[PDB]
Structures are given as C-alpha cells and as structure tokens.
Design a protein around this ligand. Structure first.
Ligand SMILES: O=P(O)(O)[C@H](F)[C@@H]1O[C@H](CO)[C@@H](O)[C@H](O)[C@H]1O
Ligand code: ALF
Ligand SMILES: [Mg+2]
Length: 217
C-alpha cells in the first residue's frame, strides 16, 4: 500500500491557482503583455515564481533589466499576498480536509510538495498545518517543477520512498515532476489540459482515501 501522499497546494488544496492567474495577468498587462489568458496560464501552473515571470517575458520576446525583473516578481507577489489574506478554512477544497483526516487515521504520511513560499502561510490560514508531517521547503531544492526534486524532497522528509507515494497535482509541470520522481500521479482538472495517460479526476471531491486505494490497486 502507498505510505505517503505528496500534495501540491495551489489548485489542489484550495483555489489559489485562480489568484496566481489573476495576479500574473495583472502584472503582464501592466507591462504591456496581453497573452496571459487561461490557456497560456496552464504553462504557469506549478512553475516557480521566477520561471513564471520569464515565461511571460518570453511570450512577448520582451527584455527587462535585472533590476526590473526583481521588482516585477516582487510586485506580483505583493499583490498575490494581499489577495490571499482572507483565505480561511472555508476555502479548503471539497474532500481535502477529510482526506487528510483519513490518511492520518491509516498512518499514511502527508507532505507538502509546493513551489510556493506562501505555502506555510496558506496552511495556517486554512487550519491545515497540523495535518502535515512535513512541508518541503522549495528554497532548498536545486531545481523546481517540472524537475522531480520537490516531490523527492517531500517523500524524503517523511521517510517514504517516492515509489511508495502518490502525488496530487493540478498542473502539467507538476504531473511531469511526479512522474520523474517515481511517485504515482493523480491529477485534478481537465484531461484536455492534463493528459489522457494518467488518472485524472474533475474535482477534489474525488480525492478520497477509498479512491486512492482504488487507483493504487
Ligand atoms: O507562491 P510563489 O510565487 O512562491 C510560487 F512560486 C508559485 O507557485 C505556483 C505553483 O504552486 C505557481 O503556479 C505560481 O506561478 C507561483 O508564483
Ligand atoms: F500549485 Al503548486 F506547488 F502549490 F505547483
Ligand atoms: Mg498547483
């Protein structure tokens, strides 16, 4: 039986992928780049803050100074951080709180495998910190999604092999990261975005321990 579940945060635990989208779109438009729509944003889900900004700059073949690049990433983050201040336990996605409870009762480890420096703040806002056996610090890994490092690090933090872990993700980059870690991915979203080659569910209510067992079998 799998011995750990490795959670992405944004778009898996709560609807903060939507806020990341709105914040990046606002930033892009401030600098005259208009191609950040929902379709393009699929390339920004799961991607580090700096890689995300660079994808936006590249989309328009735009070059900025190092000083401007730093200011832009900070600006988007500051807006995003304002956006999430009222996140509460009511914003936890359906199924997630119960999954966390059921996993603990069955002695299955729980780790966060998020790119986000805002991860600890968000888990606190949602009263979820106490469910997590570990939070992998995204600043510690040498490479971010789609590299597998963050999922490998989450599994290590809870003493479980990636091959005996399930990873939960809403993003193209994150699914690739889970695959290359050795963990089993279960995506949440549209197979049109996430592929027809892995198990995908339409919403997080489907993330039950029963179903995770169904899939693992
Ligand atoms: O919250 P941040 O900026 O530290 C983190 F890098 C964010 O991670 C998301 C995925 O969990 C992204 O999709 C997002 O672009 C990003 O800024
Ligand atoms: F949506 Al994440 F790390 F929280 F890619
Ligand atoms: Mg995500």
């Amino acid at each position: 039986m799998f011995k750990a579940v490795l959670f992405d945060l944004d778009g898996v635990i709560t609807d903060t992928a939507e806020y990341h989208f709105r914040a990046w779109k606002a930033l892009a438009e401030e600098i005259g780049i208009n191609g950040v729509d929902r379709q393009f944003n699929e390339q920004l889900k799961g991607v580090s803050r700096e890689d995300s900004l660079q994808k936006i700059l590249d989309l328009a073949d735009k070059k900025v100074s190092a000083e401007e690049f730093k200011e832009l990433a900070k600006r988007k983050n500051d807006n995003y951080v304002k956006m999430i201040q009222d996140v509460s336990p009511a914003d936890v996605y359906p199924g997630i709180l119960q999954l966390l409870k059921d996993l603990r009762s069955n002695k299955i480890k729980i780790a966060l495998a998020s790119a986000s420096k805002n991860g600890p703040f968000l888990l606190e806002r949602m009263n979820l910190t106490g469910y997590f056996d570990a939070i992998a610090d995204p600043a510690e890994v040498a490479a971010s999604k789609p590299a597998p490092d963050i999922f490998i690090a989450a599994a290590h933090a809870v003493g479980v092999a990636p091959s005996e872990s399930i990873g939960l993700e809403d993003s193209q980059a994150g699914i690739q990261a889970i695959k290359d870690s050795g963990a089993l991915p279960i995506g949440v979203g549209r197979p049109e975005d996430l592929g027809d080659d892995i198990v995908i569910v339409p919403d997080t209510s489907h993330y039950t321990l029963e179903f995770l067992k169904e899939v693992w079998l």
